[PDB]
């Protein structure tokens, strides 16, 4: 309804604010901005390179006393170039320092796939292939485990794995702490129904991310079907006098799962917050689910060899 609660205890803010694709300069007056209209989670990740500038519109609203610390919900993401085990406190400090906190909320494996190690995050082979390493998302958990131990973050989850990666973590000898989140791409072309139900079976809590299909997102060919341009949800929209941006965002929300849009444009994130104040009938929510298309935005075709890559498992 306004929070869902994860298995620590801990209130996660069901609205909150994406920071991919946000450039430097603009994402510290957007997050600003979101503050100020009562947004209280901020989805962050070291590899969207604006986590230094995320940070300085959160210090702002902290020191100038506009939110307390533990009003906010900020999340970050261990990305896949520091996937071996060594290398993962490093990472979650980088992540500390940039965004000018003491602890992190919740700080996620951003993506199963562990890259070769080194400054480069996406390092390439011959083939415009990404390389691998060689480790296991397991080990990679044994180190965010002692990241809780710690005090440094407070929640532990995941992001885009697959029903039997997160298995894989759930079955695993000597386990401390089980994922709390699993953030994955859901919205009407790809409502993820069975991986939903069972990461909720299993108490892990669902954040939806790209809810209006990531419009500019680089890839973007231009003969891709748009989400916020669809007229059949621009028509349900139009009957509750909202925008598609709005019911997009309203659907995850009613599914009870966490939504994340990303906006830099400050009348978007006033728009984007104008979504508690009406509900969506049956009908409408079944129309909005029955567009799955199984089509996915972030598909990342470049990682497919990948032995962990997520997708070529049907959930
Ligand atoms: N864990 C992962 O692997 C992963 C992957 C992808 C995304 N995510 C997270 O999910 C967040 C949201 O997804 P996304 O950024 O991929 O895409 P998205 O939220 O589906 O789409 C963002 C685009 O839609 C626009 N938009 C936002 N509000 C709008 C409104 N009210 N009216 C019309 N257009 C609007 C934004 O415009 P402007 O910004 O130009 O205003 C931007 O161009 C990301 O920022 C990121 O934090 C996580
Ligand atoms: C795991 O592989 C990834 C993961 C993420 C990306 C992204 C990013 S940062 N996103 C799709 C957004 C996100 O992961 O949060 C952009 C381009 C290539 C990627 C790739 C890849 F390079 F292979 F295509």
Not at 61 to 66: A, D, F, I, N, S
Request: proline fraction near 7%.
């Amino acid at each position: 309804a306004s929070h869902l609660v994860l298995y620590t205890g801990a209130k996660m803010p069901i609205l909150g604010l994406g920071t991919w694709k946000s450039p430097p300069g603009k994402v510290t007056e957007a997050v600003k901005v979101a503050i100020d209209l009562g947004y209280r989670h901020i989805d962050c990740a070291h590899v969207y390179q604006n986590e230094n500038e995320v940070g300085l519109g959160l210090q702002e609203k902290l020191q100038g006393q506009v939110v307390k610390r533990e009003d906010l919900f900020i999340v970050s993401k261990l990305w896949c170039t520091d996937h071996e085990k060594n290398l993962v406190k490093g990472a979650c400090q980088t992540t500390l320092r940039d965004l000018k906190l003491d602890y992190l909320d919740l700080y996620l494996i951003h993506w199963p796939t562990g890259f070769k190690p080194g400054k480069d995050p996406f390092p390439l082979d011959g083939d415009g292939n990404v390389v691998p390493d060689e480790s296991d998302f397991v080990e990679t958990w044994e180190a965010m485990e002692e990241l809780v131990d710690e005090g440094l973050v407070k929640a532990i989850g995941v992001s885009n794995f697959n029903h039997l990666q997160v298995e894989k973590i759930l079955n695993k000898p000597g386990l401390k702490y089980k994922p709390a989140v699993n953030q994955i791409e859901v919205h009407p072309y790809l409502t993820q129904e069975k991986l939903i139900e069972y990461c909720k079976s299993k108490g892990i809590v669902v954040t939806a991310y790209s809810p209006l299909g990531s419009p500019d997102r680089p890839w973007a060919k231009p003969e891709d079907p748009s989400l916020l341009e669809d007229p059949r949800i621009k028509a349900i929209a139009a009957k509750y006098n909202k925008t598609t941006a709005q019911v997009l965002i309203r659907f995850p929300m009613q599914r009870n799962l966490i939504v994340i849009p990303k906006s830099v444009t400050p009348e978007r994130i006033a728009e984007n917050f104008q979504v508690f104040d009406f509900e969506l009938s049956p009908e409408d929510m079944n129309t909005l689910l029955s567009y799955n298309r199984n089509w996915r935005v972030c598909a990342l075709m470049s990682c497919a060899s990948h032995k962990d890559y997520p997708f070529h498992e049907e959930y």
